[model samples]
Target: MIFSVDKVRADFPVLSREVNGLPLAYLDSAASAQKPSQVIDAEAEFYRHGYAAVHRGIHTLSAQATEKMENVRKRASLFINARSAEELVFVRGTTEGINLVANSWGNSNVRAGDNIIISQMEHHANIVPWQMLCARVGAELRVIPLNPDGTLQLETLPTLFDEKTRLLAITHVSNVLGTENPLAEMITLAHQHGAKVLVDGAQAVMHHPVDVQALDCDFYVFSGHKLYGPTGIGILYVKEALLQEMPPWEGGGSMIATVSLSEGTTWTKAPWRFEAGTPNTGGIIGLGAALEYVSALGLNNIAEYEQNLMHYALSQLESVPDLTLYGPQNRLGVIAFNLGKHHAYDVGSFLDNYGIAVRTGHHAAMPLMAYYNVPAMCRASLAMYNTHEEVDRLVTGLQRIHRLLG
Candidate 1:
């Protein structure tokens, strides 16, 4: 289908509404995207007709619910071009998925004095889990610092890796900086040193198509809500061989093959062993609908549309005097900036009066904020449904705020 901004905007009901007597110019998709009607209808319709505990019963509702849940696994596998649906494990969100690897695989593999490398731009979800694991296993955590342009210092990556480097956890795209990392080269370099790689794809999957096989990363994770799906559902794609090697992180009803009071319990295989207990049936069904929605629109079209929006936004935002923008000149779908001497929250509040929504503060990236010597910055992130007119409105709002503040 030919991409039309008006037609795309219509699919999102919230786009038609007004806030503070103006159209809602939503530019915070990096945080969480607004849902389309198809996802909403999918969840409601699932509850209306096929609501039941998945994989726990043999009735018709149970079978239907199970089918919907598994179908989403297949959708997620195809979304990232994983080898099989069996390689994808469902979790609450990216945080849980990372923690699962940190606790399960990290605990088993990371030995005393071993090292795990991460980049400076990682969200706390990626950093904290490794910290906890390092503290527990007596492992060392190293970081790959960014250059002044907010892009990773690829030259320094080789120095950070050695035989002791067991894993390299990195983000495919920076949530705060919108910088796309060189994942293929990074993964190849890590593999050279006999290190496993985990990619936090929370910010990348929505912006473009991801092929895990092409990237050659051992693990990839992301949240459903960021991809126009419902909340409380996310994906963790582990290479099948690695999945067989690691033990289960959590134990419960669905993950076990057999249990005994006198003898130790035996676990199910790959994906099921990791997915313990009753799954998020409704959210998974909605996620399937969301994937179908994005697939129908075509990820390539969405990516091209967003790139134009990013270019237009950069040009418009730079025109505002004394407004300093952060991140690389080449970026996607996100921009972080701050006005001269004005706090981010103040600027964000001022924009709100004009029905312009933007995220403010550290953006869960205090380290990056500290690197720039600022406590916070205002961020305007875009989605496919967002238009150049909305970008114009945001620039006008900022200009008005500048006049008032000055």
Candidate 2:
């Protein structure tokens, strides 16, 4: 069946609503995608009928809930082609996933003389955690600078790695610039230096297809909310070998074998050990539902549709006077730009007045904004439900904002 925006739009209840008595025009999927009825129903149903503590109780409802929760872990593992279900650990989303690695892997492996490599295009989530880790370990944080077009200068990466390079944490896609990095190749390069790589797939996992086996990345982290799933549920895929070595990130209920106040602690394997408290039971089920929705749409088709929309929007925005866009020629659905004479917040507010929604700020990439010498940028991120009409509305809104601000 050919793609139908009208039919697809009906799946999201939020899309049918109005803002300020006008129809809602959401364009912030990059930050957090809107959920379809399928995901909504799954979440509600799980809480309604399947509501019970997972992996704790032995009652019938608890067993059903436990099965549902384990299914989600399996689904997350298969979604990313992890080595096994044991490799997938549920966390509180991307931020917590990164922290898990920085605390568990970084603390154990990296030392005072080691260096952790990153890029200038990193979001604050990817940057600050490493900085804090470095401060604790007395390690240094090295950066791979971005090229003029916002793509990482891969040639500069080798210079950053040395004998002391212990880890490399890079984003698979720039949250602000929307550039898709060559993570597989970067992972191969980092391995030459005996440095393990952790990929922040928070942005890329939803926009593009991910295969941990094919990429051979040491670790992969992504949030469910950005992938049209429930908030507070995320996955971290650790390589089986690394998982075997690293200790648990948290110690509590589901993660321990026996806990005596005086006796030593024995942790479970990779995933269960890292998952400390009671997990987000309903959220995991909803996350599985979200992945099913994306799988049904097919990532190839989604990528092509989003790319076309991006190109169409980019061309129109380029026609506007005194506008500058950042990112690579080949990029994702995100379009980050600034009006020469207007503040990004002002433009966003103007767009809101016209029933258009977009994000305005450093986009959690303050270093990238500083590199471009811009205070902030306006980003219009697209989803499968978005259409050419929405693109036209966005352009018209921008033109109106330009007229008002100019």
Candidate 3:
């Protein structure tokens, strides 16, 4: 099917909005995407007609809600091409999903003196959880540094892995630098060292298709909001055998099979075991709709369209004098750059006055900022619905801001 950027943008109500007096030009999909009307209507429609507690009641509304929520698990599993629905668990977002693996799987598998390898381009979500786990278990945390252009230094990865290496946690794409890592190659190398790999796919999933089996990673995680869905819902795809071995991270209702003062408690299996308490029923339903929307458009087509858009954006932004762009030439729909010696916040604020929205500051990646010797950089991210006109507006806005400052 042919990709239609105009039709896709029309489905998003916020795309018609104005900031100040000019039309809104949102370019922060790396942080959070604007919800399409289908996703918005799906969430509200669920609460309006089918609100109920799932998996705990036999009433009609409860049964319907339970089916809708469970259907999302199947949708999410298919979205990433997981081996089974049981391998997918619902979490609040990427941060919570990583924390789950760090606290549950890390606590169980990591031993004292064991080492964990992570990349320098990772978001803080992937970094801090492992740091905490390493501290608690006396495991050493090793980092695979980035090259000067922000790509991973994969040649140095061999030096970081050894017999003591237990796991390798890395990001599939850098939120700040927009560098897409070579996960298939990295995963294979880590596995040869007898270390399991976890991919932080929060940024990658929205840009392209992900097959957990093809990548051969132990775990993959991403947030729904970044996929044009609602907030407060995300996915954690675990290997079936590994999920069976790991214990539950959170405990309360729904996850328990039985509870007694005398017999203690027995937990449910796999996905449910990790998901304690009541789930986000509406958000999960919305996630299903979001997946359906993307599936209809086809991820491969979206990726191709975005790649062309990124190339155009790069060419335009490069024309501006004294501007420095970060990351490799090949990137996924995100551009991070600095204008001369101006602060990122100041540049971002200047653009905001022109109704062009972009993200500023360290982008939750302080280490990357430090590596580049800059406090922060302005980031303009694109989604499938973004157009060439919006890209031109961004370039024009930046040029005007530079002229005003000069």
- Candidate 2 residue-wise lDDT, 269-295, digit = tens: 767888888888888889999999988
2 or 3, greater by lDDT: 3
Sequence-dependent TM-score of model 1: 0.98
> What C-alpha lDDT does candidate 1 achieve relative to the native structure?
0.92
For model 1, the stretches where C-alpha displacement exceeds 4 angstroms are none
Q: How far is candidate 3 from the true structure (C-alpha RMSD, Å)?
A: 1.0
Poorest lDDT segment (10 consecutive residues) of candidate 1: 1-10
Note the Cα lDDT for every prediction shown.
0.92, 0.87, 0.91
Q: What shift in Å separates residue 35 of candidate 3 from its native position after superposition?
A: 0.8
Ranking by lDDT: 1, 3, 2
Score residue 86 of candidate 1 by CA lDDT: 97
lDDT of 1 at 112: 98
Clashes of each: 0, 0, 0
TM-score of each: 0.98, 0.98, 0.99
| lDDT of model 1 at position 143 | 92
